[PDB]
Design a protein around this ligand. Structure first.
Ligand SMILES: C/C=C/[C@@H]1C=C[C@@H]2C[C@H](C)CC[C@H]2[C@]1(C)C(=O)C1=C(O)[C@@H](CO)N(C)C1=O
Length: 366
């Protein structure tokens, strides 16, 4: 091909002779192209993440497209698909492909394709060169078939901000705020039947972009993720507590937008100089429509305070529905695990009561 830059990872085939060079964080960029190209630390990983959640019916789709070093040796490159219907039924596969190819083409479009030529099966994504739009095609016969579309909402892109998440992780938000659609056919375990999934109306989400040379165990013991449009407000929170045996503070990459204007850029999480975030969890059973992780963390929700005589933004986060529960420990009375949530939100400034839904995920390593 001509004027097309490519990084091809094939299972059981060396990357040592890839022409393209590795990079770190590129300020002001989406950073969509892979960082580990011709050499990959044995613990390193890369993530292209997309989601959408409908406010009208709370259907939700969560996509995780990964590379890691281990994958090049053994087992391939994992793609995680999680869906929840309005009625709270859930569908989710971990799918592994032997080949992972990312492309920047002559137009400046970036394409990724995780594929298996043997099964004639693939999941791909495409990002416009101006990050106005991204889309995904699912084509795994008798598992998942369909697509997903994201349109960036007017306003600040937030790409001119720091993407460090503590000292060893990068977390860019290539599409911070987005309207999202999705039409999927999701097959049973035996591949004999299928159900239609249509993401509900008034759905927001986005695209995140994350890598580290270290495995997350060496990075975090706990993590919480939130993404939400709440009236004129949009926010993204990624908060981690540093690994066991560390004097480091909790790191955050938190952003608050108002009518598309970026109004708060927290890279510091505090309690009670720099834009900062308070993120404190609750256990009260105020209302009936509440739920919790199926592991040791029994929190029902969070309070989210953004602090700029600066203006003040507070939001209650109620866990209403479970998208997923996946373990990170043997079962027990003190088991840890990962939980995906349909989040319900309410707040803003003093006096304000805007309502939204959001995706959230909390992870604890044992
Ligand atoms: C499969 C790996 C994913 C990612 C890997 C390691 C990261 C460590 C980093 C320091 C914090 C967050 C972790 C990531 C960003 C993550 O948040 C999760 C997801 O991707 C979705 C599903 O895709 N999910 C299940 C998680 O909530």
């Amino acid at each position: 091909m001509s004027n097309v830059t490519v990084s091809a990872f094939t299972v059981d085939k060396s990357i040592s002779e890839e022409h393209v060079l590795p990079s770190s964080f590129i300020p002001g960029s989406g950073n969509i192209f892979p960082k580990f190209t011709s050499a990959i630390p044995k613990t390193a990983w890369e993530l292209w993440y997309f989601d959408g959640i409908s406010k009208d019916d709370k259907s939700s789709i969560v996509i995780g497209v990964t590379r890691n070093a281990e994958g090049l040796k053994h087992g391939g490159f994992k793609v995680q698909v999680f869906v929840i219907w309005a009625d709270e039924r859930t569908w989710h596969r971990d799918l592994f492909f032997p080949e992972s190819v990312v492309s920047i083409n002559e137009s400046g479009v970036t394409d990724g394709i995780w594929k298996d030529a043997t099964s004639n099966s693939s999941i791909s994504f495409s990002c416009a060169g101006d990050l106005s739009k991204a889309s995904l095609v699912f084509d795994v016969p008798g598992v998942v078939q369909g697509d997903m579309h994201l349109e960036a909402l007017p306003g600040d892109t937030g790409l001119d901000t720091d993407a460090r998440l503590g000292p060893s992780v990068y977390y860019v938000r290539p599409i911070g705020r987005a309207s999202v659609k999705a039409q999927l056919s999701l097959y049973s375990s035996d591949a004999t039947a299928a159900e239609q999934f249509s993401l509900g109306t008034s759905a927001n989400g986005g695209m995140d972009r994350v890598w580290s040379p270290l495995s997350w165990p060496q990075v975090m013991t706990e993590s919480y993720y939130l993404r939400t449009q709440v009236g004129p407000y949009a926010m993204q929170i990624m908060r981690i507590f540093p690994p066991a045996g560390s004097e480091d503070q909790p790191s955050t990459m938190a952003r608050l937008y108002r009518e598309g204007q970026l109004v708060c850029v927290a890279q510091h999480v505090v309690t009670r100089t720099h834009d900062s975030l308070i993120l404190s969890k609750q256990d009260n059973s105020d209302s009936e429509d509440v739920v919790t992780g199926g592991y040791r963390d029994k929190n029902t929700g969070y309070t989210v305070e953004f602090v700029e005589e600066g203006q003040r933004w507070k939001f209650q986060v109620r866990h209403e529905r479970i998208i997923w529960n996946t373990p990170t420990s043997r079962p027990g009375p003190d088991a840890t695990g990962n939980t995906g949530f349909v989040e319900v939100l309410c707040g803003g400034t003093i006096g304000e009561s805007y309502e939204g839904v959001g995706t959230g995920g909390q992870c604890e390593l044992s």
